Design a protein around this ligand. Structure first.
Ligand SMILES: [Mg+2]
Ligand SMILES: [Mg+2]
Ligand SMILES: [Mg+2]
Ligand SMILES: [Mg+2]
Ligand SMILES: [Mg+2]
Ligand SMILES: [Mg+2]
Length: 172
RNA sequence: CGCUGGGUAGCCAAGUGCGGAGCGGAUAACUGCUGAAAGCAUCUAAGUAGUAAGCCCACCCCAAGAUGAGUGCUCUCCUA
């Protein structure tokens, strides 16, 4: 289930065999492959990834870096943006200076730092949107805000991703 | 102590102070992010993040007989 990777994205690519560095309009990333897979610079415009001798570990890994290398370029060409939605009376979100602050019913305003790699913004008092390059830090970042107050069943009060479901119930 | 009433230091508690800290490290159960085999999905057979009175260090004392016997400063080795 492989596919060639589309890279006429006006992005620079460079390697030294065991690594692969990418440099584009809005960021720089790197990655190192183990000795099973191997990649070349196909001059046609795309990129194909071959593999070592047929084995169970390689067939799992063949389609693995295909999606990472895909996200490796799309995150440097366009980036990625995750969405959040705050549900509950009194729940707010602001960006005071660099980091952000949230008030999720606790007796203290939780404060977590935003690394320089990511970008955050808020349109309305009750929603948040993350913007970055790598899915790992971005997805891990948005998951962190979800952990402070996940969505409850009975009323859905809390943080939630967009385009998901909520197991609702009746309390009384 | 003939029997009693008081008693300094000392010893002692019922008296007087202090103590148990850490946004430090790695994990269990659990929740996850990213994401193949399996065009979907999946917390994972690549990688990675949160997190226990528990585990390790940190705190207090002992400690180079640690025969693996350590380290550093200083001193001494006269007369014919
Ligand atoms: Mg007396
Ligand atoms: Mg007496
Ligand atoms: Mg997932
Ligand atoms: Mg997938
Ligand atoms: Mg693993
Ligand atoms: Mg503990």
């Amino acid at each position: 289930g492989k596919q060639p990777i589309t890279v006429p994205a006006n992005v620079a690519i460079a390697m030294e065999g065991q690594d692969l560095k990418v440099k584009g309009p809005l960021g720089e990333l790197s990655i190192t492959y183990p000795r099973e897979v191997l990649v070349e610079k196909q001059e046609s415009g795309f990129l194909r990834v071959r593999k070592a001798v047929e084995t169970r570990r390689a067939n799992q890994m063949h389609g693995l870096f295909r999606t990472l290398t895909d996200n490796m370029v799309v995150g440097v060409s366009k980036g990625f943006e995750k969405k959040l939605q705050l549900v509950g009376v009194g729940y707010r979100a602001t960006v005071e200076g660099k980091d952000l602050i949230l008030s999720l019913g606790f007796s203290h305003p939780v404060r977590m730092a935003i690394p320089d790699e990511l970008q955050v913004k808020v349109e309305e008092n009750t929603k948040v949107t993350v913007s970055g390059r790598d899915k790992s830090v971005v997805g891990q970042f948005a998951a962190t805000i979800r952990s402070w107050r996940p969505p409850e069943p009975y009323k859905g009060k809390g943080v939630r991703y967009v385009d998901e479901v909520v197991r609702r119930k009746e309390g009384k």
